[PDB]
């Protein structure tokens, strides 16, 4: 067997990444003089995988923080063959690539 579970996993992760892209894009389009939202995106894309105290207090979208802390309490339909450390690495990759898609470096 083995085939379908990982196919489903990769498609679920891709859908998650696209949703994160849309949410953080429209969240970033409307910031202020300080670039607060861009700053927290910068901070999030380089943050160590095991940190958890920034979501105490952050301008990031609530979905992003909730998905960072415990992803499976946020989306309880997500299979547990996707690990927490897979999800925060996906969050960091998305946040980095978007922080650079919109500082226009790329």
């Amino acid at each position: 067997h083995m085939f379908f579970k990982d196919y489903q996993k990769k498609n679920v992760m891709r859908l998650l990444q696209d949703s994160l892209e849309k949410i953080i894009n429209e969240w970033l389009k409307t910031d202020d003089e300080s670039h607060t939202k861009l700053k927290s995106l910068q901070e999030l894309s380089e943050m160590d995988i095991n940190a958890t105290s920034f979501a105490e207090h952050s301008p990031l979208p609530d979905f992003v923080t909730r998905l960072w802390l415990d992803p499976h309490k946020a989306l309880d339909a997500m299979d547990k063959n996707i690990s927490k450390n897979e999800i925060r690495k996906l969050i960091k990759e998305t946040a980095r690539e978007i922080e650079l898609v919109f500082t226009h470096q790329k």
Binding site: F3, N11, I23, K106
Partner: protein, 383 residues
């Protein structure tokens, strides 16, 4: 009696026609929860939340039928279904090879295979030119090629530089005197646009002529640069021939905003293009890559890649294909038994949804997705 190779294509087309989005393997509750997360910023917590939620959820009887699927994800799913995880990842990591003048490399690799024994999968990537749209005028004392923003032209007092998307620094040619002339003929705004048609084709000030000159210099040597961006994605499956029959190809594709793979299959456009033969399909792709006629390029692109019936409109007027395109391909072989086992596991996943019809299984999926979206929105809105 059909071949396992043709059996793969038959089962793929007929399963995508009937079940569509369930062929991604994404559970309905996952889909509904993610839809809720992306729809909730469009919900007014002041208002009557139950009806706003009822409408947001109303919209994914359509988000399962709306063209929200990338071409790249369609090609990725096809490649994995037909190859398995390991071989699909290896094929993905494989580098594309550009198409020949008349597609000679691809047709040669095709002719040197037996239509009886081998089943072939070709992945095509259509790249479009994404040239710099911003000229930056900077003192040489304030220019670092390492930290500078990529995909930009930089005008210095002595240099005319291009930094591509890969961070590579290119000298565009002009000497120091010409660079100082262009430098001082341009006003001292930080950046300038290279996309103003009235500056390019109807220039009047010295600024306009400087910018048009710089764009001409970039155009006469864009050959040296890599600034192509991914535009279109698709695949072509060529199954084995059952003894003494002709060989046929089948294009699979999606196009974000136009159609899904399910729509592409239900409309039979795969066979519609299959009828024109692989050799002339490749020849027209090579023409798409080597023509400078905007009308020819647009007609080829439209009839190859549009939603069926929208061919006359896909690249007409505003949607003209006026930039050149590059067609790249990669090829692998299929083990039809493994592809059929993959499709069988997918069909088992589908069969976990109750219903005597593909209709009723799709409606079970749709209802479960709607229910999950509604309850996730109620969870996120205290309702």
């Amino acid at each position: 009696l059909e071949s396992p190779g043709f059996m793969v294509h038959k089962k793929l087309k007929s399963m995508s026609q009937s079940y569509g989005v369930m062929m991604t393997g994404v559970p309905a509750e996952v889909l509904g929860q993610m839809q809720a997360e992306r729809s909730i910023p469009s919900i007014n917590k002041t208002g009557n939340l139950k009806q706003q939620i009822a409408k947001e959820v109303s919209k994914v009887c359509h988000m399962m039928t709306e063209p929200t699927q990338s071409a790249g994800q369609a090609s990725n799913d096809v490649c994995e279904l037909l190859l398995g995880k390991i071989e699909a990842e290896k094929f993905h990591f494989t580098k594309y090879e550009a198409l020949s003048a008349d597609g000679d490399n691809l047709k040669n690799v095709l002719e040197n295979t037996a239509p009886s024994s081998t089943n072939l999968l070709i992945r095509f990537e259509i790249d479009r030119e994404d040239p710099p749209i911003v000229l930056v005028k900077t003192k040489n004392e304030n220019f670092n090629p390492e930290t500078a923003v990529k995909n930009k032209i930089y005008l210095l007092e002595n240099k005319l530089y291009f930094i591509d998307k890969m961070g590579n620094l290119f000298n565009l040619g002009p000497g120091k005197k010409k660079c100082t002339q262009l430098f001082n003929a341009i006003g001292d705004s930080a950046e300038y646009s290279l996309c103003d048609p009235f500056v390019l084709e109807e220039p009047e000030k010295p600024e306009d002529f400087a910018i048009s000159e710089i764009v001409d210099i970039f155009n006469e040597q864009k050959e040296r640069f890599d600034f192509w961006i991914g535009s279109h994605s698709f695949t072509i499956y060529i199954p084995q021939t059952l003894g003494e029959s002709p060989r046929q190809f089948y294009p699979y594709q999606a196009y974000f905003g136009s159609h899904t793979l399910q729509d592409w299959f239900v409309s039979d456009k795969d066979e519609y293009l299959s009828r024109i033969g692989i050799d002339k399909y490749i020849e027209k792709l090579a023409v798409l890559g080597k023509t400078t006629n905007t009308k020819e390029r647009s007609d080829i692109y439209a009839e190859f890649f549009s939603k069926r019936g929208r061919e006359a409109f896909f690249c007409a007027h505003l949607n003209e294909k006026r930039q050149p395109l590059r067609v790249k391909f990669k090829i692998t072989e299929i083990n039809p038994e493994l592809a059929l086992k993959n499709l069988q596991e997918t069909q088992e996943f589908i069969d976990t949804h109750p219903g005597e019809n593909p209709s009723d299984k799709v409606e079970n999926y749709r209802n479960r997705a709607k229910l999950a979206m509604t309850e996730h929105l109620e969870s996120l809105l205290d309702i």
